[PDB]
Amino acid sequence: NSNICEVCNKWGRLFCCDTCPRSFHEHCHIPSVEANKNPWSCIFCRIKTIQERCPESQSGHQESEVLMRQMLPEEQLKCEFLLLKVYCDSKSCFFASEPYYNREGSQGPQKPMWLNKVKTSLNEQMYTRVEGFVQDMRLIFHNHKEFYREDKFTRLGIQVQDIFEKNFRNIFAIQETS
Numbered sequence: 001n002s003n004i005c006e007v008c009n010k011w012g013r014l015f016c017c018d019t020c021p022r023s024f025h026e027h028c029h030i031p032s033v034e035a036n037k038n039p040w041s042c043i044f045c046r047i048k049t050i051q052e053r054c055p056e057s058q059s060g061h062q063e064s065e066v067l068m069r070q071m072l073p074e075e076q077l078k079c080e081f082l083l084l085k086v087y088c089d090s091k092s093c094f095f096a097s098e099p100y101y102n103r104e105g106s107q108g109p110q111k112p113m114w115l116n117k118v119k120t121s122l123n124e125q126m127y128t129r130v131e132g133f134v135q136d137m138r139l140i141f142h143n144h145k146e147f148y149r150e151d152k153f154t155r156l157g158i159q160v161q162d163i164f165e166k167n168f169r170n171i172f173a174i175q176e177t178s
């Protein structure tokens, strides 16, 4: 097994996957690493199993159809994995915790949003469709762009949104387009 967390790339108290060489901090994995369960398989492994059990699940899909799916166990898992893929980027730090807004010439957003809030919401089963999760994720970046205006810090929102969107298209097998 790897000697650093797959998510944050630090050492520490790591739990090792039994079916692949990845390791995790307890609260870096999503869902948080389960108490017992020997063997234990990480989210990467669980996602790969879904794909392998239904090879056709990799054929292209329309975003509109994906968004209307109910959050049954497999879609819950896919959103958890998508959230984890964002935390895997170090620039996620900017979007993890609850923001505050006091900048001359700007007003804060009407509906603040942040990664840890989406994490809690997934954990508490507050989303009934994929759309709820994706709307909250996109809102994080949209709030940032609107607040920071022409400051070059707006680019951090663009950058992390691009990680989100690429992983969304991969995990949910969105039909490739020009």
Ligand SMILES: [Zn+2]
Pocket: 005, 006, 007, 008, 009, 010, 024, 025, 028
């Ligand atoms: Zn970690």
Ligand SMILES: [Zn+2]
Pocket: 017, 018, 019, 020, 021, 022, 041, 042, 043, 044, 045
């Ligand atoms: Zn694994």
Ligand SMILES: [Zn+2]
Pocket: 053, 054, 055, 056
């Ligand atoms: Zn099948």
